[PDB]
DNA sequence: TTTAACTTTCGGAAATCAAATACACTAATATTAAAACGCGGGGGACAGCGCGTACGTGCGTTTAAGCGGTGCTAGAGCTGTCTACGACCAATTGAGCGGCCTCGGCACCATGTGACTTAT
């Protein structure tokens, strides 16, 4: 249950940096289930590029390479 | 002590020059499929509302998150060394479609000998 230790005030403070003050109980729920689906993407885009690599141990790179596959690339790391 | 820029060259590239298509558009044409004017309409989307509601709003006692030591080891990254493996050359093919030929078969003129005959 490491996605509920993710917890709901922890999910609060997250919509009030997002902008908003009123959100359903369910969306703590499905916004880990959002949070689960881009992690799982980006996870498998990673850690295929470590197992290539041969450096098993998931790298920095291969986090931004994932990103950068995916259109959501990242700065501040790849530099 | 290791990442460059001098250089010293050269042989494929990237200009040039040219003509061979060939395609775009600038354009007549009657038609004629869709445009766009023109009035109701349903239908619906918003005004206004009651009260149920649902996520904050507010307290108590928890819980994990965060440190803060205590290893210890699994890989990081680096192998110093042996190939393999693929980039090059070329030969080592090949097949497909023109080329010669060359088969045999026709029509035509040449040559010798068997009749026979005659004037030897």
Same mark, same amino acid.
């Given at each position: 249950?490491?996605?509920?230790?993710?917890?709901?005030?922890?999910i609060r403070r997250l919509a009030r940096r997002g902008g908003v003050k009123r959100?359903?109980?369910?969306?703590?729920?499905? +916004?880990?289930?959002? #949070? /689960?689906?881009?992690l799982e993407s980006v996870i498998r885009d990673s850690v295929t590029y470590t197992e290539h690599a041969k450096r098993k141990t998931v790298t920095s790179l291969? +986090?931004?390479?994932? #990103? /950068?596959?995916q259109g959501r690339t990242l700065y501040g790391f790849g530099g």
């Open positions: 249950d490491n996605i509920q230790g993710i917890t709901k005030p922890a959100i359903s109980g369910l969306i703590y729920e499905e +916004v880990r289930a959002v #949070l /689960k689906s881009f291969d +986090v931004v390479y994932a #990103l /950068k596959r």
